[PDB]
């Protein structure tokens, strides 16, 4: 806290959807103590062994003969660190990995797979600390979430359908900050996915609801978008102090 | 930040500038100097630009487009095709080749835009380099009319012939390593 | 819109990206205040 540098404290862009922008203490700890957003989840950790076995089965020749070769072998498959080889086809590998994430065979919902198309690296991180949030999945310009899923969730009790079934169906997906860097998001399905003057026609995900970017204390603020930003921080601090 | 941009020059203000003044720090964050012009140069923009050029530090790196080192065995050989003409001209009445000539050639090529912006002259640059370094560096300069501004630098003629050194016949820093050292020194320290 | 301009008024209500960017600006102001206090206090003590 003693350090007066105003770099580590500032609200970074990557905090979107994962740390509350409003809720921070004021004083020596401005921006240094943060609070999770409402829908944020923190990875618990997993063994990388099944992913490595899948990669070995697909291709990912390791101990190759200087095959990167100006990255002719597109992408270098990384894991939690540990360059484990490279593949000639990166897009087929990425699609197969996403399908496996849906079928929940080798990839738990938490496993995070990032391909950097330029620089040609795929990172595949499962390291027990990543903070991720649920985002709906957009195929073409249509959300995968449909009336069947919403109707079954509406009957949630005595229908034995829950969020985990929504994840298993492939409707929703957990995306961490590294994957948030490689994903085109839509705030709302109707306003953005639908055909208009085309800003983007390659949306890959959709926010479940924007208001979830706020934390617990800032979520009680009514009409927070109509207040000045420091006032929402003040209300977070004061709502931690209200008597009830 | 939020300082009004009257001019395109940043200035420390506020608490940090008060700290600098109060501490009498030897290194200000933004040391600046306001210069007023005495004569008609204040009224006329071209003379003011001349003063600006005289007051602004210019290294050879700022006006150099690209530098190359070619091993040229003979001056008449002209390994680079382009210099074959002007080298010939300079070697129609060769000067300082009596001792010897260096087998290595530093063929610096200057950007015309930077040269004309700073209003530098090929004779000016050549004089600075040759005089400051001494007779050791011999420079051949192109005509400004030529499309490429080329300065051909060679190591000491007497040092190449080794009659002047006498002592022991042992290469010091070879020649190409010495030429690279010379190139770095010219790039960052010419102060044209 | 991409780089932060907020065209909606407070009465109209900020859109989500405008809301996050406004939060970024407010955070910068708060950090400035908190950092300012200590440096100014040291300066004042030295002068006195």
């Amino acid at each position: 806290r003693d350090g007066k540098l105003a770099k580590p404290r500032q609200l970074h862009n990557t905090l979107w959807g994962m740390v509350c922008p409003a809720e921070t203490p004021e004083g020596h700890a401005v921006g240094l103590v943060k609070n999770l957003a409402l829908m944020a989840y923190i990875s618990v950790g997993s063994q990388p062994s099944p992913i490595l076995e899948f990669l070995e089965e697909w291709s990912m020749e390791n101990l190759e003969e200087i095959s990167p070769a100006a990255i002719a072998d597109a992408t270098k498959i990384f894991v939690n660190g540990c360059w484990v080889g490279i593949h000639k086809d990166p897009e087929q590998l990425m699609n197969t990995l996403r399908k496996l994430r849906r079928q929940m065979d080798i990839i738990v919902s938490e496993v995070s797979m990032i391909r950097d198309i330029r620089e040609r690296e795929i990172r595949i991180y499962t390291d027990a600390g990543r903070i991720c949030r649920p985002l709906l999945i957009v195929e073409k310009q249509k959300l995968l979430l449909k009336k069947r899923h919403i109707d079954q969730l509406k009957e949630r009790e005595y229908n034995n359908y829950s969020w985990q079934d929504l994840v298993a169906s492939g409707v929703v997906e957990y995306i961490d900050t590294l994957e948030e860097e490689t994903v085109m998001l839509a705030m709302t399905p109707d306003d953005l996915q639908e055909k208009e003057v085309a800003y983007c026609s390659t949306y890959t995900h959709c926010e479940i609801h924007p208001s979830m970017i706020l934390g617990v204390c800032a979520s009680i603020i009514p009409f927070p978008d109509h207040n000045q930003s420091p006032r929402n921080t003040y209300q977070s601090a004061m709502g931690k102090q209200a008597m009830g | 930040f939020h300082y009004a941009g009257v001019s395109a020059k940043n200035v420390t203000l506020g608490v940090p500038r008060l700290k600098e003044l109060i501490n009498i720090s030897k290194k200000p964050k933004t040391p600046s100097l306001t210069v007023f012009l005495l004569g008609q140069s204040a009224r006329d923009a071209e003379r003011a630009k001349d003063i600006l050029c005289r007051l602004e530090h210019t290294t050879l790196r700022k006006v150099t487009a690209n530098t190359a080192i070619y091993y040229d065995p003979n001056p008449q050989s002209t390994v680079v095709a382009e210099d074959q003409e002007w080298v010939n001209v300079y070697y129609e009445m060769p000067d300082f080749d009596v001792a010897r000539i260096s087998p290595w050639l530093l063929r610096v090529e200057l950007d015309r835009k930077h040269m004309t912006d700073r209003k530098l002259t090929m004779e000016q640059i050549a004089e600075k380099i040759n005089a400051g370094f001494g007779d050791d560096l011999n420079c051949i300069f192109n005509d400004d009319n030529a499309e490429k501004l080329v300065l051909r630098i060679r190591i000491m003629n007497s040092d190449e012939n080794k009659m002047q050194e006498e002592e022991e016949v042992v290469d010091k820093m070879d020649d190409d390593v010495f030429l690279r050292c010379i190139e770095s020194n010219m790039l960052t320290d010419m102060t044209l | 819109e991409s780089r932060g301009f907020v065209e909606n008024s407070y009465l109209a209500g900020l859109t989500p990206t405008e809301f996050f960017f406004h939060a970024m600006g407010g955070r910068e102001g708060l950090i400035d205040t908190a950092v300012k206090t200590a440096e100014t206090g040291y300066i004042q003590r030295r002068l006195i």
């Binding site: 000045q228 930003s229 | 930040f1 939020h2 009004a4 | 406004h22 600006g25 407010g26 910068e28 102001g29 400035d32």
Partner: peptide, 8 residues
């Protein structure tokens, strides 16, 4: 939060 010349 206003502009570049104002406040954040």
């Amino acid at each position: 939060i206003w502009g570049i010349g104002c406040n954040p």
